[PDB]
Symmetry: C3
Subunit: 317 residues, 3 copies
């Protein structure tokens, strides 16, 4: 079935942030047996491999923005691959890798499905522009490059000339926000972007959050869903092996709830599993805890249900 | 008071599963001071002691089902004792022991109160038949032996000739489900059993889960409540000394709220505190935590409330 | 603005309870950078230093009530300091110290604003009178001395002749309750005080709790809010370094939601951060975890929103 037909893409890239190890995200997600478990859940899994990311010598910074040609090139490569997966009538599954890869993952998806709606599950908005940013880490800027309403606010940054803004400010829902920069908060308010920060999650409950998110995107008519899951969206008690952990996250339950609900529409068209850094686990159990969580999230995106699952046969015979 | 007049039944039985230690459950629960805490809570506690489970050597498996004669006998002995306690006018308080014992606890209770409704708090449905089981562990099968609709789906199991299905599919509500086998999911959905898996708990909140659970069971008319409580229903962070732990469970708070709402109906007639395995705590602290949580749950069933409690006297005098 | 103008008062007092250390609370919270953090979120902060609590040797018990002259004098000195801060048009921020200091904090606040309402975040009611108390510890009795309806039930305790009940029973809302004494529960139900114990928070969700709390206190008319935050109101998994911890507490997110909702009214006028004891950490990390949770709740009271904040400037220029 279309909802369980998947194209796997390994994106072992870390240059959108300063912390080493996140490029090993595809390796540990694979080692934990992600592909085998998905196949055991009656999925049609095709593996497009791990993208080779060539080292860019003399990748000088654009103002304070670090590794601009490397980040741009890696997303350009990813955009090409995601579009090929989408042309094959499969759901693209990107195993990251830092969140700057969303530039390519979404751009690639929009090339085949321009009517796509984006759910962004993260502690962060990742919407700083190359000029509002204060760290110059591109993993905190991919939404700025993608938004149509920010065309003219993003300067010519090396490695990004291929990029065209493909999503309107009204086509994205944020779930999980708790660490947002002033410039990001300003953009969020001025562009009238829909979001459920942790305050909204506490207020309405994950049930009402998912009802409002799906009605906000699908209300008019069914349209393809791109879910960009940053594992720091969940609390560091579940996903500690991450680069930018923020206390008071979404529980293990809420995350499964979000992903089970998205599966049920049968409209998941693109997925990103981002920011798992296995070198950032204080103990070996902290890595395994994060990896296993990222696996459960992925499995729920393709049908694994807490109430149970069964083959369409008679088990009483 | 009726909802405070209790009769304790200790069931040191472990042969319904393969992990040693669960038989020590009634001892470690008594050693925590359970009886005393209940007395000090204005409860009429009468000790019916611990049941003597006579060892059955050469208990050859029935197909894949392990130690059937032992499990059949233990529950048979438990049914007589539970029925005796119920004839005395006391709430049966069964101390487990593995969940296979729910066979004898409910059948015994049903002999005195045939109209009873069951609230099953577990991570698991325990609804496999001696044929749909892959483990052959009878603690994962007690609901299949008790359901009327599955008469003809259960074969001649040695030790279970005394068993007569005492409840219909409509007379059971599940709360806390998160690890359901395909056979069990097929049973649950074809039998059309009411359930609240963790997905429904997240969607609704425990307030609505209980309002809906109790309305569905008690709406039509007042009826006896049998709460079968598997400590693995609660997340492993509150009850880690259990044989089959599953991540993302009911919190300590939801557990107390379930039992507080059941107390408040004044219709609790049977209680099972199952699967506390003191030999499975990863530290002596993990054992005491599971035991105190199990004690806390039990006290809430018989009136202990988080807002407080007082006697019918003027305290300002 | 009025909601970000603050007068910090240190109240290094411990004789309201037996465990040494709570007097270091103002020190450790200052050392965590509270003053600096508040100024980074556009606050006008004045520090009135730590109150000298000149020793009162010869302070024998009044019945079973411990250190009454010390508890009385500390609250008398605090009341005068809080009123002086209130007269200066600043939100009084009392860093405790044990919760017995609420007598003085609220009496002093009431002196300038007699129309104030109280929000009491705690695991306990702190409503024992000198006659209902079993422990004789005054941190468990502050509310009794303040309620108009309890006048006549308060005996003549040495060091408390300055006290006049300043709040009515209908002007206090409790949140977080889970350990209430029999005498306390009797007072709570007989006076008809609005309370949301952990049972209500479970039933309703913190969103309804806050909506009902702010409507119940401000629905008739807008008046100044006094928030008295006992850190033990949160689960000991976030605030373990405290004198009287109780499991099943308010989560980290719930504490931020309560304070976020209170800040948004723009009526917060007095705040108490009580019961932080840096000697009671089982590990140095449990101490830092407690102070940081206390600091986070505080910044939330003075505007720090999880969704983010921005200045009224064009960040895109
Ligand atoms: O733009 C920035 O560098 C920062 N702004 C807010 C977060 N604190 C680190 C930030 C990035 C997080 C990216 B993320 O982990 O969400 O992929
Ligand atoms: O039939 C089985 O062995 C298995 N089926 C699903 C559960 N995972 C282990 C199972 C049993 C749980 C029993 B219980 O701990 O709930 O008492
Ligand atoms: O009267 C008492 O001592 C006890 N009554 C219930 C609580 N258990 C300890 C008590 C006080 C809590 C004070 B508190 O930490 O809230 O300031
Ligand atoms: Mn991100
Ligand atoms: Mn993030
Ligand atoms: Mn069970
Ligand atoms: Mn179970
Ligand atoms: Mn207190
Ligand atoms: Mn307290």
């Amino acid at each position: 079935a279309k909802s369980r037909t998947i194209g796997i893409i390994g994106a072992p890239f870390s240059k959108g942030q300063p912390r080493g190890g996140v490029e090993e995200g595809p390796t540990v997600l694979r080692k934990a047996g992600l592909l085998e478990k998905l196949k055991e859940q009656e999925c049609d899994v095709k593996d497009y491999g791990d993208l080779p990311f060539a080292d860019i010598p003399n990748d000088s910074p654009f103002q304070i923005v670090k590794n601009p040609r490397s980040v741009g090139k890696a997303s350009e490569q990813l955009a090409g691959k995601v579009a090929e997966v989408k042309k094959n009538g499969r759901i693209s599954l990107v195993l990251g890798g830092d969140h700057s890869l969303a530039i390519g993952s979404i751009s690639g998806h929009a090339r085949v499905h321009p009517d796509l709606g984006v759910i962004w599950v993260d502690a962060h908005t990742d919407i700083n522009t190359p000029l509002t940013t204060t760290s110059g880490n591109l993993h905190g800027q991919p939404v700025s490059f993608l938004l149509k309403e920010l065309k003219g606010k993003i300067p010519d940054v090396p490695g990004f000339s291929w990029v065209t803004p493909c999503i309107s400010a009204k086509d994205i829902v944020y779930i999980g926000l708790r660490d947002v920069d002033p410039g990001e908060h300003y953009i969020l308010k001025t562009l009238g972007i829909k979001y459920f920060s942790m305050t909204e999650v506490d207020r309405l409950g994950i049930g009402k959050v998912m009802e409002e998110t799906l009605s906000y995107l699908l209300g008019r008519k069914k349209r393809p869903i791109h879910l960009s899951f940053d594992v720091d969206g969940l609390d560091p008690s579940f996903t500690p092996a991450t680069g930018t952990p923020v206390v008071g996250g979404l529980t293990y339950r809420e995350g499964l709830y979000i992903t089970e609900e998205i599966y049920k529409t049968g409209l998941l068209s693109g997925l990103d599993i981002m920011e798992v850094n296995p070198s950032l686990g204080k103990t070996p159990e902290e890595v395994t805890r994060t990896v296993n969580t990222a696996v459960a999230i992925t499995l729920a995106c393709f049908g694994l249900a807490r109430e149970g699952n069964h083959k369409p046969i008679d088990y009483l015979n």
